[PDB]
Design a protein around this ligand. Structure first.
Ligand code: 1K1
Ligand code: 1K1
Ligand code: PGW
Ligand code: PGW
Lengths: 830, 830
């Protein structure tokens, strides 16, 4: 579960913290600084070059995935999207700052379908996963004789564990030949063709080589050699990824330091590690921001503008989070003694103490503003701008910190250039925090503790340090800043955990229900009539000419069947639902949304998973006397041979047949050995059945079947909700009932008839959802005819999606939806 | 040219001989023997394993090529063919012992078309070529810092030359994207898709790794390391391939010894090199032979049998050539002193001297028998069997050489098991020798000189050595054997160069011409009537009911349009032509053969290149009054509007219109500004025109066009040879002439009409032929209508091929064919 996973990552981070403090026992901060200064222009330029090559390779990851799904897209646009996904992903990788999240947001604007985008994401991660495994294992079998003495392991046992991984990968590839599906439980993996996976391997290998080469050109030494370096680099990168620490922050450095810490000077390895994290992590993100900001300030400009407007908040969230990390770490790190005596000869002592504490606290403020910046909040924007401008001013006062001032100025440039993208008036503090963002805050605080304990390893701790206030008392100043961020972070965690949610949402007021029904009547969507059940909460647009109907179940808010009413109010209502859901500490879920609402949902930060398809029949060319629908015609005659009669009972006369309808309804319930549903399906509640016309089927002067008919005043679409038959209803009864309802609808002048949802009839490279959605579709979408039955009317198949807010697991949202339908709230009952 | 290339390879071999004798200045044969004995079972077993892996990889080369051409073939059969191609190819690679030659012979039986097989061969060689380049260059850029000090070159300049090759390969790949054709003169290269070339790269890389690993596990050392070893191995393998020495015999060992000869003991490197050549070269060939022989002695047995019966002579040619090399080298190598004193205590001195000299000479006899074994000669078989049985007996007498006896026994097993495959009674000595086989003999003799000079480096040369005869005088014995093989080899070269050819072949005797024409009349092929021209030599089958007609031009014998007559005599005649062509010192060429003769031609050792297609019209459903041929019908009416008249003049009345035909013929010649042709095309010779019926076209009571009609008594097919029009012949004249000839043929009861050759309307990965054939087709196949004109009659397009014996260049055969047609012999003229 989400909290258990995060706590495991934190335990791993704290152990690798113990390790790195042990491994760097005889290294001091000044050695590391001297090492950073020793690095030549040549080494830096080569590192920039290899960073560039890595990022070109990664673009090819995404182009390959698009060729595999067979959906050509423009290179400028793919390139920008992939660059943005890997910048953000390599630096962070927790919810909404993942590569997957960047890919879903960018590619929805480029017009890939949610399953397209889901398959792309499965391709790119499995590629990286099996590729990294392969590269590592192959390298380790080749250089076991060289890496063994380095790490103090038998070159025989390495060659065994290396070779064993090679065997298992080989076995997977051979068992998964010709798209055979390998099931590791709920996970179903189908690998691609040998040719696809061969080109991808070469790109994964190029990229891993280029990145390793970045770190290699930065480390001065002649004792390891690129092949051994590549193996250790690959294993470090893989272990970091498995650890689930953001960027593999300690895991990567610990694997590199342990591995190379016999051959190489650990101060030089640490210097190289600092620059590696600057050049490979911090720089491509700065560049992405600068590019998009310059665009918004040429065909190039145009391309960058359209993708960046979409991605700029996630880039700026990641930039804010990095500059927060920077401010916190700089708080626990020593300032040059040159700068302090300059500050000694001008400013007074109390200011340079204040400026320090405050800059530490503004870093934590920037990491909170980062989560907000992701949600495009205006408050988050203001907080972030104030924080950055104050930290710019303050950092020069506390250490003449020109490079920190420069980075903060880049952030203020980007924030001012794209102010328009942050218009959402949801509260930043009220929103709460997720386990992932508490874990990132926790690694930042433990990072700071490790950094202080490394930096001031020599200083002897006294209770006097806490109240020591001198122009050159950096250890005291640092200890105090750390206390600061610790207490404020503990506060944030405590608040997120104890957050109130004002119980559950309110039910459907009598006045409220009427207002929604009137909106339903003068718009096109017939299934919107399900608000009449009164089992769903209603929240209106500000002007009152649109609404969302929704349910409450555990930690999900689940909306039903798109926003309803005036098309102009949809954008606002989608955003308002997701924010209010967030405010109550619940994930937002839209159940069975159309392709028209996918774009608006993607902005709000929701991922859409195809549930099934509606069968919609064009009534304006539904020609029964035509050869195409001859059997539909034939079975009406068969119904006439069985002496079946059809009538539409208008609402005020429904009371006269309620008793007869009630008997048929329960006869059906026990015949199918089933209970009533809710939410997406109506249940036999007299007042609900009484509110709409009923199509009834009669044999020997007795009602044998019925269906409540859902219509609007616009005549754009009709549908049915309940449709039930007595056990004795003759064969063809549905054929007869459906054919007569559609002809009645056809002649009164309705344009379309909705036969309702049918489950799925292309598979991601790796999937955990397919099985889950399939077991749900059959459970709910087969009550009023099978897919084959609906196909006989030659309908348009439009897909419908489950859009879910939290990125944890699509399945958890559908399980809350399953109870809302299966059990759920009782609601209004007569 | 063929001789210049071979002489360049020999100069390279002699220089690398100087080098290897220099590099091994302080190494003695006993050190190398001690090294071979030091090798453990573990190292040998690992080497066998890596040999197995290499050979599995190479099978995937051929499967990949078949997928690229889109022609699925059974894995057992492909696997056996690829194994056989690489065994033979790695060991030899000169004409008929190349991988290409093994592929053309095996895949023709499996039913791939000659262009299929041509594209496969282009795929596999370019794959190996660019792959080896890539592997080498990539390895060299990665380990330049490690290989530099080893070879005494700047790791900077290596990284420059390595990187420059990488750049050029990269540039080729990028310019050749999307099947763009890159022309390096006559050579047109179109690379495959990124995905194909990516999977192939991974196989080439696996194979090169596995082979390198064979040599690596055999060399005892801890000072180089597998990556540096791989780079040096790849460069050695590439240089050997470029040198064109068989197996890269000295080039590979010299590159390996120079490279590793600072770090590794050269005696141990040389021991490792000996075993490498045993395990990677000699063993897979032994195994192939054993497998096929056991097959001919189960579904496995069946598969092996069908492919081996086809390939067994080329395997056994390669085995004989290796055992010849063995006997020669063993002659110049020392025998154990243990064995000689055993021979001292029993046999007398004169026998063990004789046995030595004779075994040397029988090795050279086996290398001559190898060329014969390739041609499936019975004489070659007998010679090879006698040689092997004598050398078995003799080797035990001269050195108790049990392992040599064993290898010779494998050869005698294989020869006896497949005696049936060697039935051709062509003379082995009369056949002569090619430049390639003289070059192989020359490297074998220089190999022997280098080996003797290395083995007896210490011995001080005297004229007394020549006549020293002692049980322990091995250096004398060796010197004498070397003199032996030198004089006998010089004799063979001298004979091959001075070989007589009894001038040129005889022309068509009056009696001979009649006998052929009578054969033509009672068979189906109408174009066989071209023998009547009397410009072509005729050679009959033994029973006299079939014949081949052919021409003589420079160093080619060119047959015309398949063997003619009784189907049963074709196999014998194809073989007889190729042998007699060989006897006269000329390449055999069949010009425009049908698919039915490709199999028989493939056995004889000819490679077929598609020239073009015949347009053959089914006259039994040629319905002019049908809607499908409405315009053909319309233009006959247009001809009637132009007042055109048609008649077939029977042969005895042709003299009455000769003068009128002669005027039309020359009027046509100058109008098209052209001269008469020969060989495949008739020319206006009165006696030739008089021998067959003439279709004539008349306007205003005057002949304006004519065509001689070629028929047989069987009514299976008709065609035309000359078809000529006066400059004033009205538009549609051909349409009219062709339509009337076919209707006349249709009603008299002929089943097919041959419209004649049309040039080509899928490209090898690399080709040198395409341009050449295209310039020839347009030059000769457009005299009696364009391709588009022939398509109007809706014909069957059957391809026709140029099958050429010598593997040097297809183009050289077509140039001799071009003169035979363009100029050629005058022939019989009236
Ligand atoms: C004595 C004992 C000896 C010890 C020695 C043993 C050696 C063992 C060797 C270990 C190698 C392990 C490799 C495992 C790889 C896991 C990766 C994976 O599953 O896919 C990643 C991460 O996926 C996960 O979430 C991990 C799930 C764990 C289950 C799988 C474990 C088995 C190994 C096979 C993997 C199969 C595929 C996984 C299923 C999806 C997803 O990729 P992302 O898009 O997240 O991309 C990653 C980042 O964008 C890049 O990474 C970074 O953070 C960058 N800093 C990297 C820098 C370079 C960028 N060019
Ligand atoms: C100071 C100076 C520093 C010096 C250092 C410089 C380093 C330079 C590096 C050199 C690498 C050169 C690589 C060139 C490769 C040429 C190969 C080629 O063209 O294709 C081979 C041979 O093709 C030829 O006939 C050679 C023609 C030369 C022109 C091309 C030269 C440019 C290089 C690019 C090549 C492009 C492709 C060539 C055009 C067709 C054909 O393959 P085969 O089927 O004959 O297969 C070969 C054998 O079956 C295997 O080889 C053996 O004999 C075995 N013993 C090998 C053992 C392992 C088997 N698994
Ligand atoms: C949850 C998300 C985490 C993602 C993190 C992943 C990536 C890791 C990068 C971190 C922050 C990058 C942004 C910062 C970039 C700016 C870097 C820069 O310019 O250097 C200094 C920044 O302050 C600083 O010393 C800050 C130093 C930042 C670099 C440290 C990288 C750490 C990795 C090394 C291995 C140890 C592992 C740590 C765990 C034990 C300024 O110098 P200046 O002249 O003004 O005066 C000296 C100074 O002491 C004044 O206070
Ligand atoms: C044109 C075509 C050329 C293709 C050639 C490419 C491949 C190269 C293999 C050659 C022949 C392979 C067949 C021979 C396999 C049999 C090998 C074997 O069993 O060993 C001995 C064979 O005799 C021998 O010493 C013969 C030795 C054969 C192995 C030598 C390989 C040479 C390569 C090493 C580097 C130098 C480069 C040479 C150029 C300077 C028998 O021992 P035995 O107990 O009976 O008593 C010792 C003896 O002195 C009795 O006379």
């Amino acid at each position: 579960r989400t909290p258990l996973t995060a706590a495991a990552t934190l335990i791993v981070f704290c152990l690798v913290g113990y390790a790195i403090m042990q491994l760097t026992n005889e290294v001091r901060y000044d050695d590391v600084v001297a090492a950073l200064a020793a690095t030549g222009p040549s080494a830096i330029l080569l590192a920039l070059f290899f960073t560039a090559l890595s990022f070109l390779s990664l673009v090819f990851y995404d182009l390959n995935a698009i060729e595999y799904i067979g959906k050509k897209l423009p290179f400028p646009h793919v390139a920008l999207t992939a660059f943005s996904a890997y910048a953000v992903g390599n630096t962070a990788g927790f919810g909404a700052l993942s590569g997957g999240a960047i890919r879903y947001r960018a590619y929805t604007r480029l017009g890939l379908s949610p399953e397209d985008i889901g398959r792309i994401i499965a391709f790119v991660t499995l590629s990286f996963g099996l590729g990294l495994a392969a590269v590592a294992s192959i390298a380790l079998i080749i250089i076991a004789s060289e890496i063994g003495p380095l790490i103090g392991v038998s070159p025989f046992l390495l060659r065994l564990i290396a070779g064993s991984i090679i065997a298992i990968l080989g076995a997977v590839m051979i068992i998964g030949r010709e798209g055979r599906v390998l099931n590791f439980g709920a996970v179903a993996i189908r690998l691609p063709d040998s040719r696809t996976w061969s080109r991808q391997f070469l790109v994964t290998a190029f990229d891993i080589a280029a990145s390793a080469s970045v770190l290699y050109v930065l480390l001065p030494q002649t004792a390891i050699g690129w092949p051994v370096f590549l193996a250790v680099y690959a294993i470090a990168v893989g272990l970091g990824v498995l650890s689930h620490v953001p960027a593999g922050l300690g895991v990567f450095e610990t694997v590199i330091i342990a591995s190379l810490g016999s051959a190489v000077n650990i101060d030089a390895v640490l210097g190289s590690l600092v620059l590696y994290r600057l050049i490979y992590h911090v720089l491509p993100l700065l560049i992405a921001v600068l590019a998009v900001s310059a665009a918004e300030l040429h065909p190039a400009a145009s391309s960058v503008r359209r993708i960046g407007g979409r991605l700029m908040p996630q880039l700026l969230s990641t930039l804010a989070l990095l500059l927060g990390v920077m401010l916190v770490f700089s708080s626990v790190t020593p300032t040059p003694d040159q700068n302090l005596e300059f500050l000694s000869n001008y400013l007074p002592l109390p200011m340079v103490e204040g400026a320090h504490f405050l800059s530490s606290l503004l870093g934590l403020a920037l990491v909170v503003a980062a989560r907000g910046l992701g949600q495009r909040l205006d408050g988050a924007w203001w907080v972030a701008v104030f924080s950055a401008v104050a930290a710019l001013t303050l950092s020069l006062l506390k250490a003449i910190a020109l490079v920190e001032a420069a980075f903060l100025a880049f952030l203020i440039f980007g924030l001012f250039v794209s102010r328009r993208l942050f218009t959402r008036h949801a509260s930043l503090l009220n929103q709460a925090m997720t386990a992932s963002w508490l874990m990132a805050i926790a690694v930042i605080v433990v990072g700071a503790v490790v950094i202080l304990l490394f930096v001031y390893r020599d200083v002897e701790y006294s209770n006097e340090l806490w109240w020591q206030f001198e122009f050159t008392a950096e250890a005291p100043r640092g200890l105090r800043a750390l206390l600061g961020i610790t207490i404020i972070s503990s506060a944030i965690a405590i608040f997120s955990l104890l957050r109130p949610a004002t119980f559950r949402p309110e039910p459907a007021t009598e006045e409220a229900l009427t207002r929604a029904v009137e909106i339903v009547r003068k718009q096109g969507n017939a299934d919107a009539n399900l608000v009449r059940m009164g089992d769903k909460s209603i929240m209106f647009s500000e002007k009152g000419d649109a609404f969302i109907m929704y349910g409450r179940q555990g930690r999900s808010w689940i909306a039903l069947f798109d926003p309803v009413g005036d098309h102009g109010a949809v954008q606002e209502l989608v955003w308002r639902f997701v924010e209010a859901a967030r405010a109550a500490g619940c994930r937002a879920v839209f159940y069975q949304i159309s392709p028209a609402l996918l774009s608006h949902c993607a902005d709000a930060g929701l991922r859409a998973f195809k549930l099934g398809e509606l069968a919609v029949a064009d009534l304006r060319t539904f020609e029964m006397k035509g050869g195409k629908w001859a059997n539909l015609r034939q079975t009406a005659s068969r119904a006439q041979r069985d002496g079946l009669e059809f009538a539409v009972v208008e609402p005020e006369n429904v009371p006269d047949i309620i008793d007869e309808l009630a008997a048929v309804s329960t006869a059906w319930l026990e015949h199918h050995n089933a209970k009533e549903k809710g939410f997406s399906l109506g249940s036999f509640d007299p007042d609900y059945v009484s509110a709409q016309p009923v199509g009834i089927l009669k044999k020997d002067g007795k009602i044998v079947a019925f269906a409540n008919i859902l219509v609007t005043e616009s005549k754009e679409e009709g549908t049915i909700d309940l449709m039930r038959f007595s056990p004795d209803a003759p064969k063809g009864s549905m054929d007869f009932l459906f054919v007569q309802i559609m002809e009645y609808l056809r002649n009164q002048g309705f344009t379309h008839f909705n036969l309702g949802m049918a489950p799925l009839s292309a598979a991601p490279v790796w999937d955990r959802i397919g099985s889950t959605v399939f077991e749900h579709g059959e459970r709910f979408y087969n009550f009023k005819g099978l897919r084959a039955f609906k196909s006989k009317f030659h309908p348009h198949w439009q897909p419908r999606y489950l859009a879910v807010s939290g990125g944890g697991n699509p399945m958890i949202a559908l399980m809350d939806a399953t109870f809302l339908i299966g059990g759920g709230l009782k609601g209004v009952v007569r």
